[PDB]
Specification:
Name: EV71 3Cpro
CATH architecture of the largest domain: Beta Barrel
Strand order of the largest sheet: 8-7-11-12-13-10-9
Keywords: protease, inhibitor, hydrolase
Number of strands: 13
Entry title: Crystal structure of EV71 3Cpro in complex with a potent and selective Inhibitor
CATH class of the largest domain: Mainly Beta
Distance between the termini: 32 Å
CATH superfamily of the largest domain: Trypsin-like serine proteases
Assembly: monomeric
Bound molecules: the ligand N#C[C@H](O)[C@H](C[C@@H]1CCCNC1=O)NC(=O)[C@H](Cc1ccccc1)NC(=O)/C=C/c1ccccc1
Shape: globular
Largest sheet: 7 strands, antiparallel
Number of domains: 2
Radius of gyration: 15 Å
PDB class: hydrolase
Helix content: under 10%
């Protein structure tokens, strides 16, 4: 419903299409010149943000208090424009909704929205060796390259799509304290 209406504006305002040595991803700007990517996108010194070279001043691969992986990488971008501060839409702890929307903006999947249904606090996952935490699960046969689409609901940004097993698809929960 207004889930979609909410999501198009988010992607219009704060999203971009990023390419790295590891493939094409969806990127979400959080505030200032900070954005998030799936950790496994492994951005180096620069990245292709909507086909232009934007430099990456700093990058923190995010982890637990236990050091456990969280599959989130924070990017300070070297560009003038500030993003819109969407931290007000981020939860303090993982969120479960019955109706949720996954949104991708890559060249393979340009500007597409998916009524993905029910998100549940899946918690732990061993993702190709890498044990990662605070996962959100949904029953949709996602694929490459839909990382790292954005998981939303009415006025919530829930997480960032980082993996899938061909039947379910998983998102790294996107919490407030990840950003001061
Ligand atoms: N685009 C894009 C992403 O690279 C892609 C989306 C996947 C692909 C598969 C099919 N379903 C999806 O959505 N994610 C990926 O490719 C991630 C990358 C990753 C590597 C290491 C740690 C965490 C994440 N990997 C996976 O999703 C596969 C993990 C897995 C496989 C078998 C059994 C249990 C877990």
């Amino acid at each position: 419903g207004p889930a979609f209406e909410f999501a198009v504006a988010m992607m219009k305002r704060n999203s971009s299409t990023v390419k790295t040595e590891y493939g094409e991803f969806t990127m979400l700007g959080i505030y200032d010149r900070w954005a998030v990517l799936p950790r496994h996108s492994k951005p180096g010194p620069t990245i292709l943000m909507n086909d232009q070279e934007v430099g990456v001043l700093d990058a923190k691969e995010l982890v637990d208090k236990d050091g456990t992986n969280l599959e989130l990488t924070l990017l300070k971008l070297n560009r003038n424009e500030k993003f819109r501060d969407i931290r007000g839409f981020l939860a303090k702890e993982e969120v479960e909704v019955n109706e949720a929307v996954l949104a991708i903006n890559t060249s393979k999947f340009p500007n597409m929205y998916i009524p993905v249904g029910q998100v549940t606090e899946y918690g732990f996952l061993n993702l190709s060796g890498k044990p990662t935490k605070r996962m959100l699960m949904y029953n949709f046969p996602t694929k490459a390259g839909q990382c790292g689409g954005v998981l939303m609901s009415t006025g919530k940004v829930l997480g960032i799509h980082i993996g899938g097993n061909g039947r379910q698809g998983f998102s790294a929960a996107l919490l407030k304290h990840y950003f001061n």
